[PDB]
C-alpha cells in the first residue's frame, strides 16, 4: 500500500506516465459514482434532499501571468467548459461556439444592460460586446488582474461599452438592475446558493433573465473533495469547501426568489475536449510556459509544480467528464425569471 | 394480426386468462418506457421540458353504489396508492399506514385547518379528525355521493370537527385560507397545473404548508393515452384526456407560486400491492358485487362490464407499477410552502 506521499512525489517528479496517471483518477471517480448511486430512487431523492438541505444551512495574491494562460488556454482563455460541434472543431471555435450558445439560451438581443458574474478573463463579455453593440455589458470578477486584461482587450477591439466591477459578488452591494444575468461555472465556488439567488434577483426586474451554466453529475451533487485517504487526486486540484459538484437538478430547489423557465445540459465529451485541447496546447508550448512563469515564481522547482498542477486539472478533468461518454459528470444550464 | 374490437370482445367474456392478460399488459408498458427514455440525459431533458412547456399551454352521473365500493376496496375505501410494511400486511393495515406517512410529512399537527383536495372517500379527512380533535379538517369533492358518504361516517365515529365542500376545484371561489393543504392523487386529473398550484396559494398564508402526493413515472411524464393502435389497454382503462403521469420531478417546474421544502417517492410495489389486494377482494366478493350493481346497472352485461372495467384496472396496474420491481412508475410526493 502505497501513500499519498508516495504518489504525490512521482507525480511532481514526472514519472508517473498519462496511461497510468489517466488509470488512477478514472478509478477515483469511479469509486465517487459508487458513493453517489443508490439502489432506488427513493433512495436516491433521500440522498438528494439531505445534500440540499446541508446546502441551506450552511452561511489569495499570486495569479498567473497573461502571457501563460494565452499559452495554456484558447484565443479568449475561457475557463469553462466549450461546444465542439466537429471533430476538427479548434479550442478557439469552440470557444465561440459556447459563447453564441450562451447568447441563444439566454435570450441576449441588442440594446439590453447584461451583467457576466465571474467574468473570467472576459471572453463572454467582449463577445457580448463586439456583436450587439447597443447592449451595455459589465463584467464582475473579484480579481484585479483579469478586470486590466478585460480592459485592455476592450480598448484594443475599439468597445466603448465594456465596464468591470472589481468586487466579490457575495459582498458587493447595489441598486443597479440588470436586463440579463450571467453566471458561467462561476456558482460552484459559492458557500452560500440560497443567498447567492436571493442576491441576484435583487438586480433583476421583472423583465430580466438568469442564465446559469454550471458543472454537475446527472444523478447526484458532492463537494469536491477526497473520499478516503486513497484519492491525492482531489484535494490536490482544489482545497477543500472550494468547489461543488451540483446535480444537474439541484438548482431547481433553490427557486426561492427565481422561477425557472428553461433547463438543459450538455454532454460531458464537450468539457473533456475543453481540458483535451488546453492540456496539449500546454504540452506544445510547455518551453515558453516555464520560461514565462520562471520571473514571477522564482525557481524551476516552483515553476515545475505550478505546471504540474495545472496539467494533472486537465488530466483528471478528461477522465471525469469523458466517463460513459459523457454521461456522467457533465454541465447543467438554467434559464430563470425573477419571482 | 388481431384488431382491438377482437381482444376486447374476449376481455369482456372472461375468455383471457389471467397469465395472459398480465402478459399483454405488461408488454404495452414496455412500450412506453422504450417511448420515453432517451439516449442522453440531454436528449432526457430536451423531452422533458417539451412535455413541461406542453403543459403551460394548457387553459358522469353513473357512480358506483357504496356497498360496491366497500366490497372491492379496503375499510375507509381509499383509492390511492397504500403502504405496506411486512409481507402480511393487510389493505386495511396499508391504509392506516399511508395516512400516517401523509400526516407525518406533511407536518400535520392537532389545532391545525386541513383542507384535503379531492378527498374521495374521506378516508384521510377522518384519520386526521378522529387522531387531532381540535384539527378542524375540510374535505373538498366534486361528487355528492362521496360528500354524503363522508358525512355519514363523520357522525358514525362522534366527530364533530368535518366539513365538506361540493365543489369542482377549478371553479371554487373563496377567502378562506387553510394551515395545511393535502392533495392525494388527484393533481393527475387536473387539465391546468399551473393554475391548480396557483389557486391553491392563494388559500394559503406565510405559515401554511401544502403536500402533493401523485403517481409518477421516476424518469419522463406521459399523458395515460395509447401509443399506437395495438394498445387496448389505455383507453379501455381512462378516456384520453383525464389522467396525467408526471414524472417525479414535474412539480419542480412549477413553483411560480408555491416553494419546494421536501421531496420524496415511495417504491412502486406499495402500489402494486394495493391494486393486488383489491383485485383479490373483488375476486372473493363476485357474487356479492353482481348482486349489488344489478338494480342500478339494469342488466347482468352492464354489470359484468363495469366489474371488468374495474378488475382489468387492477390488473393493469399491477403490471405498470410492479414494473421492475416498482422502480419505474410509482408515487411521488412533494412538500411546498407559499412565495
Ligand atoms: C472538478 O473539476 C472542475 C472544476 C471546475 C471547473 C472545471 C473542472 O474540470 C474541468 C470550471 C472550469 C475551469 C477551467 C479551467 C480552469 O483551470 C485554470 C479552471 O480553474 C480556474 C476552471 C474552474 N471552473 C470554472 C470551476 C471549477
Ligand atoms: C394509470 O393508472 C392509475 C391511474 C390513477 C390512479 C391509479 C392508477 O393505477 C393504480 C389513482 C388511484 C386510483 C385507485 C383506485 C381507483 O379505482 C376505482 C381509482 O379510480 C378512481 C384511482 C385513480 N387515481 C386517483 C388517479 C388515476
Ligand atoms: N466571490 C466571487 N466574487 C467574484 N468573482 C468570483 C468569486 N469567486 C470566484 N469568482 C470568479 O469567478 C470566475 C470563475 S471561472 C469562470 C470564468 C468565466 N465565467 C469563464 O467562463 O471563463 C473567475 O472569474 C473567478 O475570479
Ligand atoms: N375538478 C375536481 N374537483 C374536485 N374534486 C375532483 C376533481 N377532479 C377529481 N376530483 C376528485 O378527486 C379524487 C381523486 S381519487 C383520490 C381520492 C382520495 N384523495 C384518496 O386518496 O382516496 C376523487 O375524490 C374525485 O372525485
Redesign the interface.
Known sequence: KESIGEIMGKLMQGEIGDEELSKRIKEIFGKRLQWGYKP???QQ??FN?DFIKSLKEMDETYELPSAFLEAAFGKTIKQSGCYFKDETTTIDEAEEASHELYCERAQIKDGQTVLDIGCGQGGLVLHIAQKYKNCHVTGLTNSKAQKNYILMQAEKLQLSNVDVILADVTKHESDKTYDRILVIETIEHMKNIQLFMKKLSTWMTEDSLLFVDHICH?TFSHHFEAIDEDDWYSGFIFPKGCVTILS??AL??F??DV??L??????GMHMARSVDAWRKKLDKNMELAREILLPGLGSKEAVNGVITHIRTFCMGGYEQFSYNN??EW?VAQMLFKK?
Chains 1, 2 share one sequence.
Open positions: 432506488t430512487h427513493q431523492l433521500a434532499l446527472k444537474a437538478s431547481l430547489y427557486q426561492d422561477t425557472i428553461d433547463h438543459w445540459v450538455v454532454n459523457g454521461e457533465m419571482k
